[PDB]
Design a protein around this nucleic acid. Structure first.
Ligand SMILES: [Mn+2]
Ligand SMILES: [Mn+2]
Ligand SMILES: [Mn+2]
Ligand SMILES: [Mn+2]
Ligand SMILES: [Mn+2]
Ligand SMILES: [Mn+2]
Ligand SMILES: [Mn+2]
Ligand SMILES: [Mn+2]
Ligand SMILES: [Mn+2]
Ligand SMILES: [Mn+2]
Lengths: 106, 99, 80, 93, 93, 105, 98, 93
DNA sequence: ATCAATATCCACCTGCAGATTCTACCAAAAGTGTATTTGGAAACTGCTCCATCAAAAGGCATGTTCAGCGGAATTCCGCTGAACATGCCTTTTGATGGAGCAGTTTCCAAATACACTTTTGGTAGAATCTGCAGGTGGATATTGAT
DNA sequence: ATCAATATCCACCTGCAGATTCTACCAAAAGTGTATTTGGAAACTGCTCCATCAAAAGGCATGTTCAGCGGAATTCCGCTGAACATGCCTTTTGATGGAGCAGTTTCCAAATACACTTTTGGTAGAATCTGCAGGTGGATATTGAT
């Protein structure tokens, strides 16, 4: 007896991802590798956000990641910001940004 | 001789200030009434979960803040720094919310 | 007061501030209340339809979250 | 009462990246949102890929094309690698 | 080899509303797209409606909420009546 | 022998609509009422756009509806316009419209 | 000789092209552009002719609608002449560039 | 015959964006209700259009490769457009 | 450009709300065996797309002339920001009934699953049909010129 | 203001492809009629958590005051694009042939869908644990006037 997640070398739920697929009405049948592949990709994307979110946590002298750190991580990254282009991260604020023309004479 | 900060200087201060934080900006209760009121026009005798009303506030403020960013670019485009009703209108027009 | 009026010039100005706005025409305030109203009427009309379909009496965060998704305004951190 | 979520796994993964780091209640909720959203987009895109091709099965081939249509430039290339790795590994087992 | 379309139906409906009016193939192609598009939007909304409610059946009840979620007010009001009517009539058979 | 559309008093094909719902994996099961209702909605909206389009055709003194008539129909009606706000009708053109500021004295 | 004043023929053209549905870009040139771009993603590819047509119908409706927005932008700045900064602003708010 | 070569060559395609001419760009603007055009607008439209086509074509070819086909079909484009939120009626989709 | 008035930043301590870890249940995933089905391979086909070729005219490019647009600059009224004194009300606990959202068991109507009789939608098509595309021009405006 | 140069709309008429009418083949579909499985409403009651009145209380909304400077109007003129005319390139059109590809048909097996019983990974509530919100205030820093 071995978790499909371990045979694939993943932390993510290969088995539940497989069940979420059957139940979601995406297709009649779901091939063997599909849940593995998808689990693998979901883990990858999570590791990416947490990594950037993490660094964002450090940079603010804190050790635990709050929503704001997720926001800074996503909106500062060209690619993630595009993937989450029409998604609102609750309690994330906005990136500091003042239109230079608004700055006082200098 | 009192001390007066020049017009606009306190304004830029509030900007850096609020762009640093993530806390809501509409008083929670006043917001609760507006939401209850509106829902009422659709179905009477309605109850809302706490998070439900919270979700709406996060959504509402994220929406408005972003519209202000767009509204500001429209003002700047017209060589101004004061945002006006027509800037909001041009923004919503181009986004597809109007028509 | 109409409740919408409960959305004060100071609150609005604050939102505008996070939006990077520096100056603000006096009429912006009303214009903003109307815009907000239209926004909430849209999401809530959809949220309620979900409640109503669920033969329920309470509006859950999930009804809101679904309405927002439905409106292309996907929200994270309240279920879903 | 039983209510599923990806929280534990998010947390395992977090440790693999930032061993000495934690995560607020809300932030973890957001992460769960994320995984569901992305799951849906990929599944759904995969679902119509199979229908466009008059195919009744969703294989990893579909998950792969889906990831390509959905993820921005570099994000897609990396995701596809990881995806392929695990399937290869999973078969060698 | 043989493909389908709502062409014959769109034509039946065209004659009821404009008996002396015809339709070019291009215009009919566009009409065929419209039906398929609206069909998908409605079925899709109904599909997720059912999922949210852990129902495994899509009933006219789901089609109805979908129609309400999807269509602009005045259009929703009429479509819902024509649909409630059709089903009711159907049942009396 | 009676077509399931005829007792529903509909022109759109209830059987067909019923199979498409199945073939699409929208749900595990599809109640008998669902396809009747959806086919009535499709029939309705198509009658609605054929009405508006036929009028646009008759105004251009044409007998057969072409794509530009479908476009004139949709874009002149608020609702249909919103229903199809993110849709492009091939060969439809745009509505004749010029901003006032661009006009002469 | 005769000379219409600047803006007159322009307005005439607007009325002319808003009254029709003909594609406004030459076919062949458009087509080469499609194969060129497509060849850069995958080599040896042929196209159904309707495929090119669909791309041209989608491209022109997109550009025409983008010009409408751009126009509102120029008029917003009190101009009647559209400029790159006008196209840039329209795409920014549409969320294409930002 | 199926020997040394690649089976004859079609001339190399280069600089085709320049085919979208100033006159064509002005015609589109006219239909968009534009009365006056700055000289710099032409190159800007070409670049915008190039980004537009790359995006659609990139998705279309992705469905094409997925079906293990060598011909980009109208359905491929139609799905590509739907995908980008630019649904097109009149070509099978 | 120096004070001088003020707001934002940053150091240290400490206790609790909120995060993390531990503690046994059990829904769900994994393991084995039988049954059902999908979709690549091989082999022949047939529509479709590619690439010419030839003729010719529609439309692109270029150069000239100047109308009028947009932006620089100066002016000046009044709208909005900063400041401040007055008090209304939103916010924080938090404790208390009960409308309601759910968890559990029962089970009829409603929805499969499958074999059969029967109709209808799609395709080819020769026939005929017939809406309307493409090309010319005076009557009716409306300038642009003088 | 009078007069010539002109674009567009609507009528003129036959030229033919694109739409409509049978003629009929004819299967993939839909309808009909059993045997059969089951999703979900219905009656039922627990553990949520939603509405709410108490209500002290200071954080925050508000009304007024004073003038800083931003927006909007006006005047002006360089020079950029609009209009147009000339030359002629290349797109458009239409008929033609060749091949590579797509699509249909038959088949063998690898792969997936059950059906059922055995094994824990994941969840919830409780017990253990700690990161950072907060309070205080001189230090650092930026703003504004004489
Ligand atoms: Mn190339
Ligand atoms: Mn001017
Ligand atoms: Mn009760
Ligand atoms: Mn028939
Ligand atoms: Mn004509
Ligand atoms: Mn059940
Ligand atoms: Mn100024
Ligand atoms: Mn030349
Ligand atoms: Mn265990
Ligand atoms: Mn602190």
């Amino acid at each position: 007896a071995k978790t499909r997640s371990s045979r694939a070398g993943l932390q993510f739920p290969v088995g539940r991802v497989h069940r979420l697929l059957r139940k979601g009405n995406y297709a009649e049948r779901v091939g063997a590798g599909a849940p593995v592949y998808l689990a693998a990709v979901l883990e990858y994307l999570t590791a990416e956000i947490l990594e950037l979110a993490g660094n964002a946590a450090r940079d603010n002298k804190k050790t635990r990641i709050i929503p704001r750190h997720l926001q800074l991580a996503v909106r500062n990254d060209e690619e993630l910001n595009k993937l989450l282009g029409r998604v609102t991260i609750a309690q994330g604020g906005v990136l500091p940004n003042i239109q230079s023309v608004l700055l006082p004479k200098k | 001789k009192p001390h007066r900060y020049r017009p606009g200087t306190v304004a830029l201060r509030e900007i850096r200030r609020y762009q640093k934080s993530t806390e809501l900006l509409i008083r929670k209760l006043p917001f609760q009434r507006l939401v209850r009121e509106i829902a009422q026009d659709f179905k009477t005798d309605l109850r809302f979960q706490s998070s439900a009303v919270m979700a709406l506030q996060e959504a509402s403020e994220a929406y408005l803040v972003a519209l202000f960013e767009d509204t500001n670019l429209c003002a700047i485009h017209a060589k101004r720094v004061t945002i006006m009703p027509k800037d909001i209108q041009l923004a919503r027009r181009i986004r597809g919310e109007r028509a | 007061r109409d409740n919408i009026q409960g959305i004060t010039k100071p609150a609005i100005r604050r939102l505008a501030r996070r939006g990077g706005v520096k100056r603000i025409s006096g009429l912006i305030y009303e214009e903003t209340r109307g815009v907000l109203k239209v926004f909430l009427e849209n999401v809530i009309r959809d949220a309620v339809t979900y409640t109503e379909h669920a033969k329920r009496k309470t509006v859950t965060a999930m009804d809101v979250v679904y309405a927002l998704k439905r409106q292309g305004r996907t929200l994270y951190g309240f279920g879903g | 009462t039983r209510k599923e979520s990806y929280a534990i796994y998010v947390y395992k993964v977090l440790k693999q990246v930032h061993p000495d780091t934690g995560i607020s209640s809300k932030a973890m909720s957001i992460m769960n949102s994320f995984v569901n959203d992305v799951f849906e987009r990929i599944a759904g895109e995969a679902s119509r890929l199979a229908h466009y091709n008059k195919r009744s099965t969703i294989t990893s081939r579909e998950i792969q094309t889906a990831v390509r249509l959905l993820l921005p430039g570099e994000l897609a290339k990396h995701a596809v690698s990881e995806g392929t790795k695990a399937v290869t590994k999973y078969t060698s087992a």
